[PDB]
Design a binder for this molecule. Structure first.
Ligand SMILES: CCCCCCCC/C=C/CCCCCCCC(=O)OC[C@@H](O)CO
Ligand SMILES: CCCCCCCC/C=C/CCCCCCCC(=O)OC[C@@H](O)CO
Ligand SMILES: CCCCCCCC/C=C/CCCCCCCC(=O)OC[C@@H](O)CO
Ligand SMILES: CCCCCCCC/C=C/CCCCCCCC(=O)OC[C@@H](O)CO
Ligand SMILES: [Ca+2]
Ligand SMILES: [Ca+2]
Ligand SMILES: [Ca+2]
Ligand SMILES: [Ca+2]
Ligand SMILES: [Ca+2]
Ligand SMILES: [Cl-]
Lengths: 25, 25, 25, 25
């Protein structure tokens, strides 16, 4: 388990990646 | 909970995101 | 130890870095 | 505390940031 702030940051980072890929495609 | 260095990195990453968005807007 | 979602995000981030470097080289 | 892989990723991310800033300055 991780600090909730670290979980939140990981979620935001993954979604940032996903949105960038979808934008480029 | 997380290593303090990982918490710090998550904070910096989130703030980096926020600043980028504000700059673009 | 960390939340599995945080481990996954860290792996994805490292691989993202690696792929970017290989692309540029 | 965090998984060692997550600590490593956080270190790499911070250093990536630092190098980018120094390059731009
Ligand atoms: C990038 C596409 C998605 C939009 C993302 C835009 C950025 C939004 C960022 C929001 C930050 C919310 C983070 C919320 C973090 C909450 C921290 C908390 O309540 O617990 C503190 C712990 O440290 C105590 O153990
Ligand atoms: C990007 C906009 C905001 C400016 C950010 C610029 C980058 C600044 C980076 C500073 C790095 C500070 C990290 C500080 C990390 C401290 C680590 C610590 O004291 O505990 C070590 C643990 O591993 C032991 O359990
Ligand atoms: C960027 C080059 C590599 C391609 C990456 C493309 C992005 C793929 C992202 C996939 C996200 C998979 C994350 C999978 C995360 C699973 C979370 C889980 O099962 O446990 C939940 C815990 O919170 C409970 O403790
Ligand atoms: C970007 C400027 C700095 C150069 C960075 C270039 C990228 C180098 C990346 C290297 C990845 C090394 C990560 C090393 C991670 C080791 C994982 C480990 O041994 O423990 C596994 C745990 O999950 C078990 O609990
Ligand atoms: Ca906390
Ligand atoms: Ca430590
Ligand atoms: Ca969990
Ligand atoms: Ca932990
Ligand atoms: Ca492990
Ligand atoms: Cl963590």
């Amino acid at each position: 388990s991780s600090d909730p702030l670290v979980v939140a940051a990981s979620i935001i980072g993954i979604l940032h990646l996903i949105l960038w890929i979808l934008d480029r495609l």
